[PDB]
Design an enzyme around this catalytic site. Sequence first.
Site, mmCIF file in Angstrom:
data_model
loop_
_atom_site.group_PDB
_atom_site.id
_atom_site.type_symbol
_atom_site.label_atom_id
_atom_site.label_comp_id
_atom_site.label_asym_id
_atom_site.label_seq_id
_atom_site.Cartn_x
_atom_site.Cartn_y
_atom_site.Cartn_z
ATOM 1 N N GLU A 1 -9.611 3.310 1.295
ATOM 2 C CA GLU A 1 -8.845 3.329 0.011
ATOM 3 C C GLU A 1 -7.788 2.332 -0.139
ATOM 4 O O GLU A 1 -7.726 1.849 -1.261
ATOM 5 C CB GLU A 1 -8.388 4.832 -0.377
ATOM 6 C CG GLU A 1 -6.757 5.141 0.269
ATOM 7 C CD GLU A 1 -6.798 5.056 1.796
ATOM 8 O OE1 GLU A 1 -7.866 5.472 2.511
ATOM 9 O OE2 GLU A 1 -5.544 4.994 2.421
ATOM 10 N N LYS B 1 -10.705 13.268 6.481
ATOM 11 C CA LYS B 1 -10.369 13.017 7.867
ATOM 12 C C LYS B 1 -10.163 14.413 8.694
ATOM 13 O O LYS B 1 -9.696 15.383 8.156
ATOM 14 C CB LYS B 1 -8.539 12.444 8.079
ATOM 15 C CG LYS B 1 -8.557 11.108 7.437
ATOM 16 C CD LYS B 1 -7.243 10.505 7.564
ATOM 17 C CE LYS B 1 -7.188 9.209 6.921
ATOM 18 N NZ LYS B 1 -7.970 8.188 7.662
ATOM 19 N N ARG C 1 -7.530 -0.856 0.822
ATOM 20 C CA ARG C 1 -7.999 -1.953 0.598
ATOM 21 C C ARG C 1 -8.420 -2.208 -1.039
ATOM 22 O O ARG C 1 -8.215 -3.197 -1.727
ATOM 23 C CB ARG C 1 -9.208 -2.674 1.128
ATOM 24 C CG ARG C 1 -10.594 -2.027 1.236
ATOM 25 C CD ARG C 1 -11.509 -2.220 2.076
ATOM 26 N NE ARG C 1 -10.698 -1.366 3.664
ATOM 27 C CZ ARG C 1 -11.502 -1.730 4.486
ATOM 28 N NH1 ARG C 1 -12.563 -2.603 4.804
ATOM 29 N NH2 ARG C 1 -11.031 -1.057 5.698
ATOM 30 N N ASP D 1 -12.270 6.869 2.356
ATOM 31 C CA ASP D 1 -11.228 6.729 3.380
ATOM 32 C C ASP D 1 -10.785 5.322 3.637
ATOM 33 O O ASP D 1 -9.721 5.043 4.377
ATOM 34 C CB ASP D 1 -11.382 7.227 4.670
ATOM 35 C CG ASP D 1 -10.376 7.793 5.502
ATOM 36 O OD1 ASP D 1 -9.025 7.504 4.840
ATOM 37 O OD2 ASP D 1 -10.378 8.352 6.735
ATOM 38 N N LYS E 1 0.863 -1.017 0.250
ATOM 39 C CA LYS E 1 -0.166 -0.068 -0.038
ATOM 40 C C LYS E 1 0.754 1.189 0.017
ATOM 41 O O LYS E 1 1.483 1.608 0.881
ATOM 42 C CB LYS E 1 -0.859 0.218 1.354
ATOM 43 C CG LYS E 1 -1.746 1.148 1.301
ATOM 44 C CD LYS E 1 -2.475 1.502 2.652
ATOM 45 C CE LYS E 1 -3.313 2.700 2.745
ATOM 46 N NZ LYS E 1 -4.086 3.383 3.977
HETATM 47 C C1 LIG Z 1 -12.585 5.608 7.965
HETATM 48 C C2 LIG Z 1 -12.461 4.022 7.864
HETATM 49 C C3 LIG Z 1 -13.500 3.489 7.004
HETATM 50 C C4 LIG Z 1 -11.065 3.329 7.815
HETATM 51 C C5 LIG Z 1 -9.810 4.086 8.262
HETATM 52 N N1 LIG Z 1 -8.487 3.604 7.604
HETATM 53 C C6 LIG Z 1 -8.039 4.643 6.716
HETATM 54 O O1 LIG Z 1 -8.292 5.834 6.427
HETATM 55 C C7 LIG Z 1 -6.708 4.047 6.300
HETATM 56 O O2 LIG Z 1 -6.780 4.541 4.883
HETATM 57 C C8 LIG Z 1 -5.522 4.595 7.039
HETATM 58 N N2 LIG Z 1 -4.559 4.720 6.258
HETATM 59 C C9 LIG Z 1 -5.190 3.662 8.284
HETATM 60 C C10 LIG Z 1 -4.552 4.134 9.498
HETATM 61 C C11 LIG Z 1 -5.437 4.465 10.595
HETATM 62 C C12 LIG Z 1 -4.852 5.277 11.627
HETATM 63 C C13 LIG Z 1 -3.373 5.084 11.789
HETATM 64 C C14 LIG Z 1 -2.610 4.886 10.852
HETATM 65 C C15 LIG Z 1 -3.262 3.988 9.771
HETATM 66 C C16 LIG Z 1 -9.855 3.626 9.933
HETATM 67 O O3 LIG Z 1 -10.431 4.026 10.780
HETATM 68 O O4 LIG Z 1 -9.364 2.301 9.877
HETATM 69 MN MN LIG Z 2 -8.080 6.093 4.325
HETATM 70 MN MN LIG Z 3 -4.963 5.172 4.227
#
Ligand SMILES: CC(C)C[C@H](NC(=O)[C@@H](O)[C@H](N)Cc1ccccc1)C(=O)O
Ligand SMILES: [Mn+2]
Ligand SMILES: [Mn+2]
Lengths: 519, 519, 519, 52
Positions: C371, C299, C373, C369, C287
């Site tokens: 993204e 975010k 996967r 968000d 990724k």
């Molecule tokens: C909002 C949800 C649908 C998904 C969200 N994940 C993401 O946005 C991923 O793209 C993030 N890149 C995952 C992440 C979260 C916290 C610290 C480091 C990495 C998550 O909260 O896990």
């Molecule tokens: Mn994300």
């Molecule tokens: Mn991400």
Amino acid sequence: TLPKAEAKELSAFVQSCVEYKTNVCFTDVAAYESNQKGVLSSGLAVLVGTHKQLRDPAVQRLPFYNPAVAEAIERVKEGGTYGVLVEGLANAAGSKFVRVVVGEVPTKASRNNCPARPDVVTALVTAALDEVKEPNTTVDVFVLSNAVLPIAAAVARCGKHNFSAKDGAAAAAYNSGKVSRLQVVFPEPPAIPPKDLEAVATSTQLCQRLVDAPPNLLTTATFTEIAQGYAKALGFDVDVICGDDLCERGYGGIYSVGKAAFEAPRLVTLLYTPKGTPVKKVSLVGKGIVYDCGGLALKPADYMKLMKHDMGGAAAVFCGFLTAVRLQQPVQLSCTLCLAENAIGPKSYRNDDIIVMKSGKTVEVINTDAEGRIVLGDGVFHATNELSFTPDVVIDMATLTGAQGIATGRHHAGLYVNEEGAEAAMLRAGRESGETCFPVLYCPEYHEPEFKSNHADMTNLMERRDNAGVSCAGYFITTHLSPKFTGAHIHVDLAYPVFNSNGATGFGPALLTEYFRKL
Amino acid sequence: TLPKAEAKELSAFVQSCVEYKTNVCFTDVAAYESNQKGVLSSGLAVLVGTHKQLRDPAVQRLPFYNPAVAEAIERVKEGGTYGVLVEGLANAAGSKFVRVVVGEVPTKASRNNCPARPDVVTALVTAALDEVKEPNTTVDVFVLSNAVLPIAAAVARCGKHNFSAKDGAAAAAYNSGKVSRLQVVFPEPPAIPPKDLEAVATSTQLCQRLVDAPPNLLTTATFTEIAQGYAKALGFDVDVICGDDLCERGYGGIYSVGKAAFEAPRLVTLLYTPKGTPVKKVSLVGKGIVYDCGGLALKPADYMKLMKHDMGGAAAVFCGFLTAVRLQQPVQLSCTLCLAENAIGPKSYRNDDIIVMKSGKTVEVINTDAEGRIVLGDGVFHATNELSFTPDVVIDMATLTGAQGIATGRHHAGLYVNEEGAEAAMLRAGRESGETCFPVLYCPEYHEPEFKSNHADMTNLMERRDNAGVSCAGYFITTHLSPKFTGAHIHVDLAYPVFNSNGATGFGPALLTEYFRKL
Amino acid sequence: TLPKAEAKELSAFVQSCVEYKTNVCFTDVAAYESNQKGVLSSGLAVLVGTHKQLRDPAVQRLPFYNPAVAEAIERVKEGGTYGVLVEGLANAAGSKFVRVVVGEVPTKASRNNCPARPDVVTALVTAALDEVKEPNTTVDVFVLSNAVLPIAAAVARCGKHNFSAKDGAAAAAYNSGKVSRLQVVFPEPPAIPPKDLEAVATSTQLCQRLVDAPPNLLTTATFTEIAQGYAKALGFDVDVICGDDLCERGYGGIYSVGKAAFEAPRLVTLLYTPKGTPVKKVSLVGKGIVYDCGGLALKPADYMKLMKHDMGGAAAVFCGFLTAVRLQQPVQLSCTLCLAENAIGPKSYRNDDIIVMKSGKTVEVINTDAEGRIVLGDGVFHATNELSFTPDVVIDMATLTGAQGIATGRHHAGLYVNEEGAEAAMLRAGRESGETCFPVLYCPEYHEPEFKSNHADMTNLMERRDNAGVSCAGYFITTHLSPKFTGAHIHVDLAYPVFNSNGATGFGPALLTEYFRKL
Amino acid sequence: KQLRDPAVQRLPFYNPAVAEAIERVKEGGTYGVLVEGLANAAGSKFVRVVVG
Ligand SMILES: CC(C)C[C@H](NC(=O)[C@@H](O)[C@H](N)Cc1ccccc1)C(=O)O
Ligand SMILES: [Mn+2]
Ligand SMILES: [Mn+2]
Ligand SMILES: CC(C)C[C@H](NC(=O)[C@@H](O)[C@H](N)Cc1ccccc1)C(=O)O
Ligand SMILES: CC(C)C[C@H](NC(=O)[C@@H](O)[C@H](N)Cc1ccccc1)C(=O)O
Ligand SMILES: [Mn+2]
Ligand SMILES: [Mn+2]
Ligand SMILES: [Mn+2]
Ligand SMILES: [Mn+2]
């Protein structure tokens, strides 16, 4: 003091739980043919099995089988049901038609699951029982699996719940009038005797009843009374440490958590010693938070809803204990119920308060909504330090963290275990029983720094909540184990597996029964 | 229980309400010329009418009229005021100058509004009274409309409120010292007698007083005492079911909601039977939540502010009832006040608790902040099942939903009504009285599924909150109507119309008076 | 197009990464005695080991040992450091005093941890290097463990980072001027040759550099250029699918995620085939979200900070690949970098949009968000379907879920694996390398229903987020595996282990190296 | 009421199973029954009749 009408209702509810009898019985195809001579118990029959099992030639020999049923087998979808009428089938209810509902169980099952997929069995039978026409009938449930224990528990937890307040049931001590008697018909005589299977089913359902029950019925006091009732009936020992006595006796954790509530907190310990030499000495400890409002750290209403389930761990260990007594399993057991309501009011323990735990360790309360670990800390210290024996194994069960759902999900209880061997044994028991578990990270060296406090030995909440939250809550509990204890500790976080969208699942007791079996 | 100083204060406040007398009187131009002979009551006079009415030749013959006043009429803006001094106008205060404040009422009025636009009348007189130089004076308010009922209520609700705690008023039982006596001067002798108009105005203002009063003064107990005081004085019947007796007698809804509070809940029923054959039997039921903290489903502080207004529906029905008694309207009435404080503490009813309503139906509490519908459920069942008569019409009034403001707004109470005829009649009463209403969707077949419960007959909260929320709250209430009742049910959601940025409006009583008039 | 000054800066930064050389070298005590004849490299020396190792008689024979150092050994706390001056110790910097910093490594290590506790080794050396007096020096780091691989990576990730923008370093292509050369001195000649250890350390630090680098420097384009630079230098293959060509070639996932951004998305595949027969064919997929703003599902700023780390999985596989090439490991490798910025603008893929994945399966976007996967779904399909070989094992690495931190914590990457054997092997590699992992629930039958869509084959987000979130994200990725693939799939969720409060950790490459070693 | 109209009996698929479906079906619900050897254009051994 309570209003007389409320006290009368509580007594009746206590009695309903103490005298609870299951609606499920068990037999096999040959015994059924012999006792019922091809006469169905009622106008509904259920047939559940895998795609392949449903096509076995033996199925054709079943008393309800005909070409319509054969067509149902072709038309049913995996995980779904399909119903067909059969005209002029002999049945005890005398109906021109018998409805036969076929359900297909998947064979897909990952290495972390029960191969018999009792999860789907439950759902199929639940769906089929929605076709019941009248009440107080007996429904024949023909199962094509011989996985008797997981199927027994699966059927026990299916359908309409024994706990009900619908349609005047409140006047009948909240015993549902909507439940059907269920006769499970295995292909072969079950490897576990029918009466033993009944005892398991009874415990699943009693557990379900206790969890489903709202906190206005299941209180710290009524739960205690229920335990006392079973003690008188089955002849086991019961020890109760109540209210202010908890404080006087140094049980600062459970005292502090519970003291704001209308009903006093109680540490309730039950003892069962088998005849002859026990294979193991096991102490059970259950989170019996009858309601978790959050305390001063008040939950929003959407999260507070269903916190009547927060005693699900106590119910699990309680009912597993009952099954062990009833079946006279050769395990020496203590069962410690950590009973409190986490209430809000002038006597609320505070975000800042410092607790002196029974262990002698001091806990700075960062958040009052992390109450379970505190209560369990007193519970496990009690079990490992204050009993007439020292256990070989401590099992605590608790609806402990939201993290659990995030980590291991709705069907797998999280295991935090200090020994690989005990862990593997509990996992095996989960796969066999259907009450599945999955491990969470055991790494005390990484959990320990999260609980640093300026003024107390430890806090009750992690500085960083994104650092193995299921594990850290377990770690907290371990810090309160007596130094006298050197055995295996199994922490079971079952926050989510104790319920689904229909209410309580009765998850936990069968797991324990199966675990005890293989000790 | 209470400190002596607080109890004394409460008694005094009760007495201030029981003895409340209005500051408004009513007359007409010719009677005024006859009794006062061109001498103004004080140094302030108010003239309010439409653009056209203000230009009627009759206006020139008013005792204060002169060229400055004519100019005020030219300069005043629609919905606004304009003041001018008039030198050497005879007046009872001996003021060198008399200030004449002209106010222009719009003629614009939609089909859902009162054509006389009393809303603006109230605002104009309020603004004009800000020019009062000395207190304890009588201000002549010359109105050019002959819409006597809506104007009477409009003036009753205008200006400074009879409830006050400013500048030592707390030592005077919170009777404001800042209120002016107001003499309303209609063009013609009023179609409704002045003493009858006084009774209406009195009820508007008593209603305002009760609503304005903070909950430390207006409690479940003091509200009950006030009702009892009026019962002794006017000779009507009063029945009180108090505290734990509510539980013993099966009133689980109001009991459960109120039981956490310092002051006990009460179901207070008042009876009035006129001397003749009544034109109708009407049962009134009012939400008397003296304060709505949300219970365990705690409100944030910004929403919790102004929840002293949550008894606005009980005040409305109470004061409408008083007017009917005082004017001897030919309606047989019950008035049931559902009195409770929705408090937070150890005895709080819970999010999960299951209530056995007086109706016999069970209610699963999803959210404790949806308390009003529960309390009303017990109220309407009481009215429709437990009285010596069965009503033809049930009217419940309640500050019930935030959805009401979103749906029908600040000036129009929402109507949920099981019959088109009763709905149309209440709407007409709203348009005539000025206390305007507007219907919300009546569609029980769509509301019903929102209240599905796993374990109880129903929940107290919709699964989906975006599916006609004003309507669904009404629906809930209807499920607790007695089967003995087959009449018209009018649910009035008056969450917002009971207040504005100056405090209580006294909305509701005049609406009822007008409704009773046309029965 | 970019401003010329920004383009120059980017080129320089690319070059700084392509030419990156480590600051760490490795030797052993006897070789050190032989080459340096008791003359320390500088005025700082570091001695790190367990309580017991520090008291081994061999320690006394170290060139800096004296009674003060013996005292430091007594006084140092577990997990802490303790420094002492030694006067007139021969050293290459000609320093009057040499500072000797002792650090004690714990022996406590749970069954899920690396016994050598390289986590503490890193922290100790980091602390000790804070005592460096001057720059451009060589610091002798004497380690008493012979666990050469974990120590090498531990020291590689310690101290000040090679990426820096402090004190004019921006003018030097962001190469830190604050980094000390480090000479690791093992007790025995290392089982792995020093130049091989250097290659490992180099990959840890390059990985660190890429992750630390802000997205204004490390873009989809510069990452690609860096990969191309290494391809030229080391002679491996590189394939780039860029921008709109992704859309034309059916890569709807990575195209849709990346298309809103200023820099185009790229699917970058690298190939390495060893001389002779490979022990295994392994496809790596990373990724490479250079920045994750959330897209339209934006975010909040506090969560968006540190999303420059969202390419940590791409960096990990990239650097693990580089090590394999540099050391000529006998594994055939593909390395697919899924490069995109998840940006917000008019071209943003939407919450509602339906994507046609390269796999041919359609994905309804619930949340933009989620993204990662999606991007990985295209990556794994590419690897398993579009290459000149079919891999035996697919390993994807990604900073994928916040759930990962909740489930397995800051130090343990979560593993979702379709085979027990591969899982156990990766776990073993984590314990040996120090780059520790822990399994999450593998149960596709329970994950699958979470992704049901009305109109597409699947959604990209679970209906219920509290049902094994780490696992469910993994499951999504698996649905896009080619049917041609029947091997082991290892999903590595390393959201948290890629960083700590000092920045990037360079977690991942060494894990892979060790995994490859034991194949 | 409409389901119990005599005209319903004259529908080409009607038989005693369908009559039973009409008894067993819940308000707002469905109930399905197989009818063997009913002529149909797909040549299906059974025709499924779903009453609502
Ligand atoms: C909002 C949800 C649908 C998904 C969200 N994940 C993401 O946005 C991923 O793209 C993030 N890149 C995952 C992440 C979260 C916290 C610290 C480091 C990495 C998550 O909260 O896990
Ligand atoms: Mn994300
Ligand atoms: Mn991400
Ligand atoms: C707010 C936090 C300090 C602690 C909090 N946990 C709790 O309050 C526990 O007492 C809960 N009883 C755990 C829980 C959460 C969700 C569903 C079932 C059970 C949690 O978030 O897990
Ligand atoms: C939180 C919900 C379950 C119900 C809630 N309503 C209440 O709490 C009622 O008891 C309020 N008394 C209604 C209300 C809201 C705003 C202004 C005036 C009056 C509402 O949102 O309408
Ligand atoms: Mn809890
Ligand atoms: Mn809690
Ligand atoms: Mn309210
Ligand atoms: Mn409320």
